[PDB]
Symmetry: C2
Subunit: 49 residues, 2 copies
Amino acid sequence: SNATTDEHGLVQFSINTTNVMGTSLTVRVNYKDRSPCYGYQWVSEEHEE
Amino acid sequence: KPQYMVLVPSLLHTETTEKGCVLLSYLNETVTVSASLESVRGNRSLFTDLEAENDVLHCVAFAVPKSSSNEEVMFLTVQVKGPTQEFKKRTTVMVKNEDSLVFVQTDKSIYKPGQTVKFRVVSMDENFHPLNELIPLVYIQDPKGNRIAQWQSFQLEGGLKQFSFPLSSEPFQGSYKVVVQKKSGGRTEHPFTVEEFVLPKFEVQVTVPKIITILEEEMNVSVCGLYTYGKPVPGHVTVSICRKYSDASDCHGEDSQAFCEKFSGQLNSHGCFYQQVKTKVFQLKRKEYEMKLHTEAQIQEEGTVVELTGRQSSEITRTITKLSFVKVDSHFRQGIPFFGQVRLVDGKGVPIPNKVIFIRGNEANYYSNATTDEHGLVQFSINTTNVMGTSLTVRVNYKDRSPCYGYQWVSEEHEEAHHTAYLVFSPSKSFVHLEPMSHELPCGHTQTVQAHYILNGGTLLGLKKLSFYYLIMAKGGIVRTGTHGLLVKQEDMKGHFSISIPVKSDIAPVARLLIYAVLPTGDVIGDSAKYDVENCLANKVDLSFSPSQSLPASHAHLRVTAAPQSVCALRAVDQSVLLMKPDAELSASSVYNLLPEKDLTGFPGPLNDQDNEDCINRHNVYINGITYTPVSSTNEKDMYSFLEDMGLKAFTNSKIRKPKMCPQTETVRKYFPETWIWDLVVVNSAGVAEVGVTVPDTITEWKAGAFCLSEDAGLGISSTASLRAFQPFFVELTMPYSVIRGEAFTLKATVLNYLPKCIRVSVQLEASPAFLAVPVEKEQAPHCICANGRQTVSWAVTPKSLGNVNFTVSAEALESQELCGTEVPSVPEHGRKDTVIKPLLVEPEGLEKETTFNSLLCPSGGEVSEELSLKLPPNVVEESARASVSVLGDILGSAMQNTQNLLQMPYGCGEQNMVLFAPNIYVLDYLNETQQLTPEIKSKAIGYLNTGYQRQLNYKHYDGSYSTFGERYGRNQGNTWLTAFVLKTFAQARAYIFIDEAHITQALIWLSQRQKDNGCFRSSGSLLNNAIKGGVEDEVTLSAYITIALLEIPLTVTHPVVRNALFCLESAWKTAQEGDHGSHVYTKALLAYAFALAGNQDKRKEVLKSLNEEAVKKDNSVHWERPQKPKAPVGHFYEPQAPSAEVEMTSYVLLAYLTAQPAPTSEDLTSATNIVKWITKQQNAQGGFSSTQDTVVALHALSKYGAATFTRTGKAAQVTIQSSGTFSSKFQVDNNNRLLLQQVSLPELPGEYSMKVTGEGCVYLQTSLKYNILPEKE
Ligand SMILES: *[C@@H]1O[C@H](CO)[C@@H](O[C@@H]2O[C@H](CO)[C@@H](O[C@@H]3O[C@H](CO)[C@@H](O)[C@H](O)[C@@H]3O)[C@H](O)[C@H]2NC(C)=O)[C@H](O)[C@H]1NC(C)=O
Ligand SMILES: *[C@@H]1O[C@H](CO)[C@@H](O[C@@H]2O[C@H](CO)[C@@H](O)[C@H](O)[C@H]2NC(C)=O)[C@H](O)[C@H]1NC(C)=O
Ligand SMILES: *[C@@H]1O[C@H](CO)[C@@H](O[C@@H]2O[C@H](CO)[C@@H](O)[C@H](O)[C@H]2NC(C)=O)[C@H](O)[C@H]1NC(C)=O
Ligand SMILES: *[C@@H]1O[C@H](CO)[C@@H](O[C@@H]2O[C@H](CO)[C@@H](O)[C@H](O)[C@H]2NC(C)=O)[C@H](O)[C@H]1NC(C)=O
Ligand SMILES: *[C@@H]1O[C@H](CO)[C@@H](O)[C@H](O)[C@H]1NC(C)=O
Ligand SMILES: *[C@@H]1O[C@H](CO)[C@@H](O)[C@H](O)[C@H]1NC(C)=O
Ligand SMILES: *[C@@H]1O[C@H](CO)[C@@H](O)[C@H](O)[C@H]1NC(C)=O
Ligand SMILES: *[C@@H]1O[C@H](CO)[C@@H](O)[C@H](O)[C@H]1NC(C)=O
Ligand SMILES: *[C@@H]1O[C@H](CO)[C@@H](O)[C@H](O)[C@H]1NC(C)=O
């Protein structure tokens, strides 16, 4: 689910509990996929999630 | 002891006179030698009887008969027939039909539209002589790839033929190329560019060090600008220099350049601008190699900015210090201390004297120093007393210095010279050495080589005269032969003897020379060496001009000395078009590289291996004496090795091989400039003088060259002789290529005075109705300008009329006294007034727009016709509209290149083997439908086909499936896609090579076991990569593949598996059509062919209409592409799941269009022809396509189109085109010119045309209408 950053760049939310034990939660933003040519090669400027 | 010997080259060219020599050495009786060449299989047989006297080297040549196979291996057996004794020996030789070396010269490197292109083609043999060959075709390929003109089946008259093609008024700006396909196929290509430009009057002479040392503070650099007789021009230069670091990544910007020391200044008259730049700003480390040096000489009194990116060849070498050998023996003996010379170099080929060196010998322990003599050099010799292999290294000055951390820095390198010489196997401890002289030998100048000899028990019979023989070889064949008769007393201690050798030119760049003795003990002793010969021609030709300078003079002689009788091709062109794009290198060195078999060293090893006769090596594995020693391999040199290195084998009696074998006119007017003289002449007994009338647009120097062909002295090439031409008082004008009709522009006129006296002058521009000149400066007062002076006058000209406009402009030296200058000698002799008439064309105003009308018209053995009405909007500018039509049988473009690279050797697991086997079916399929096929390839293919089938069968299961790994353990479950794929290709495969039907039925059954009514097919197993499939692993995309593969296997639509698969695909479309959230295209294109193939012509058109609407049209090339807006997949599968999703799904659609049950309609196939135009263009350079599952469907879709279009028996195809108003034009398309774009213009303002086609075979009719509309509301 998407949302927008409120004043002071922030977003609170909750989710429904009905699955197995270990629950992985990642949050991606703006542009996760982009083309900085190769990964390792000569220069990396990753945008941390 | 009775001895004989016959030497022959291991590669004998067919239908070329191939020399082979014979030596019979000891008498007994009169004997007859005889070589007989005969086929490995079949009844082909020959015999050449050779004469032979005692103790002599008689030679003989012979032409060999042709073989249908490009290269065939045959048996050659020599036989000595004599009353007393009879000897014979066999070996395999390779014959080959080595085709001619041909080339094309063009009048220019570049062309302007409408101008006629002139070229000339020529053919020679391995001796550079005119060869009157029959060339089956030549043709001009445009930048888009369409063959625009061609000349079929013709013979070269004097070893050459001149041609001409007029370029269109509206051609395609870009690079073209003329191509000559020999009888064998060998396409000799040659390019040229076509574009609109305005030629340059001046060069920009950039001077930069060619290779510069790393360790540097600064460097000298300079830039000048001249044109005729070296008269420089003044201008505000803006030079730059920026280096590009070694980056293996781009990312949008892609500008590898970094440090930028730009500069600025003015050029001095009678000179240039000079500058020294500090190199420490560049910090030449961390991957730094090349660097461009741009220029910008902006000439004053001209808005002309002519740059020149010169010396983009300035370099920075890691080997800042260096050593190398010069003259060292690579073959030696323990009984003669060997000699070897070395030379010192410092980065840029600089020899440094008086600097200590350190020689190091890892054998005789020769660790001795010396100092470099004048020209940085040191010769020396060492003592021979060790086991065979000797390693000899030499390390200098800073042998070991500065072992810096090379991770994040430049390894401050220093080269080192080393060599490993081996000793020869001595039979009777006697031998022969050849003194080496490696360095470029000049031809037309004799050389003499020194030969050393040693007899330590060599005598044995004790005869007076011992014959020594020698041979020289080049171009893969023996050229010259001779002998020398050394005579000896008793046990000849030593001695020195030399043999002469004229450097003639009949010897190519390599000159392999051997020498060898014939002892009665039954031994051979000799040596062989290589000498680099300079690349030179035999017909010595030289070009010159009787006059020089002058102005638009008449009769200027042009003289060519050459062979007594020779045809000589001349070429003279302004050195402005030559300045523009340099002409394609045509020198002696250009021709020598064109020669096949520059050198023959070693037998033809990859295809043939004549390397066996007897293994007596392992017979003995006994004892030495003091402690048992079992035998093992060696690395010594023998006589065989020297003959092998030569590239000729030998049939012989005497001991040649080592033991082991088991181990492996107009007053004052100017015009006419492009190409002055393109012609040819015949040389009388000496030379020949051509009286060329001089050109008038002689603002620059006329550079001109030539070449000759003679039956005796081969071919020759002249030294480009120039001719200036400079009127002291002249006028030039700065102006563009084209201009727009309505919009005004700025014309300039620049007058010059290189005459010593000073003159005042007026500027006349004679107006005409076609334009309106408005001077920028109103006063037309004459202004003084003295020696090396100039004045410019800008006029604001607006063209009225359209087309070509010929301007007029005059300038006269006014004698008006009461002058600004300290003197008034304005009146010169007769140069006093010069009038220039230089035209430039004009285009129509507004915004241009174009329409296109393609239509495949196929008369099925009768006639078809279509009507073309060309409308025009009311806003078209008058005469701005124009149009033309084209005709052809196109699919023979990709079909040239692609065919070659594909069909590979099968290997790998179940996944990999299919990638190599699967294409091999569809290529064989496509090659057959196009008609272009060969039995030498069909056989080579079937081998990679039958093998891959049996190899694939190795990864099957008992249940009929096929897994990525297979079953070495069998801990797998076959993947549903791989099985389905196997089956689709085993259905195809089954047509050429016969397949076991059980494997398909076994698979088919297993596919039905993993079939669910709803959702049709289910995913089964794992995959190493998703590269083998455009399938989006969705049940819809998978079932969409299994359903095609199942229908492609001839199966009825009433089948229970297909009935429950088709049910699923109607539900898949009806929902994938309804809800845009779900599918998008890969699926849409698969659902198309599946329906078409199944027979729902109604549902087919239902999906095909919403597909066609969702398509991506372009330049008459319609196709499809994955819409890139949603997301971008993984960094490994980002390029196949989109570009290959594009280039497979398109060819999937194509099949759906082609696949109509009665037959595809004219409306289906004409739309299909457009899709062919894109896929055929979007082709992989080497051959094939991006992924593998696209390469396969592309070829299957092409071949299936190719079946519908082409005709075998339909030779004739007629095409007429008329208009309501008396227009008429016809053409003829047939079996040979289907591969040619036959074009014609159309004259009507309101088009009302009729296309009529007749006979058999298809024709593609593309009509393009172009115009220019001017509406605007701003
Ligand atoms: C592969 O290429 C071969 C040719 O090398 C193709 O075979 C040719 O196909 C046509 C029909 O498409 C044949 O014409 C018919 O021949 C019979 C006699 O067998 C005759 O009674 C009919 O009136 C008609 O003329 C043609 O003879 C046949 N053979 C040759 C040598 O041209 C084949 O279609 C191609 N395709 C595949 C997948 O093999
Ligand atoms: C964030 O989530 C919401 C709700 O899931 C998405 O909202 C829909 O957006 C479309 C236009 O893109 C509207 O037509 C609908 O009215 C919206 N509502 C629903 C419930 O579908 C929204 O698109 C998402 N944001 C982004 C950036 O995709
Ligand atoms: C260089 O070669 C000569 C060959 O003539 C060597 O001379 C022999 O040396 C041995 C001793 O090692 C003597 O027994 C022989 O009688 C010498 N022969 C002659 C003809 O003088 C010489 O020793 C070698 N020197 C080096 C340094 O390699
Ligand atoms: C512009 O004027 C020149 C010079 O008169 C024309 O060029 C040639 O003129 C001679 C005059 O004797 C003719 O014989 C040639 O046939 C002309 N050349 C060509 C290619 O036709 C030139 O034609 C004029 N341009 C226009 C568009 O009228
Ligand atoms: C889970 O809780 C959320 C609360 O935001 C609610 O919207 C959703 O309907 C609930 N679903 C289920 C399966 O309980
Ligand atoms: C010829 O050669 C044979 C075989 O080596 C030998 O018998 C004979 O003596 C030789 N000489 C003469 C003079 O025949
Ligand atoms: C072909 O073979 C026959 C024997 O079957 C033989 O008589 C003939 O010499 C051979 N032909 C040639 C050209 O050598
Ligand atoms: C480079 O210029 C310097 C003067 O600045 C001069 O001494 C030197 O000889 C020039 N280099 C060459 C190789 O001419
Ligand atoms: C070179 O060799 C000679 C003699 O062996 C010796 O005197 C000299 O010191 C050596 N040179 C160097 C640089 O050591």
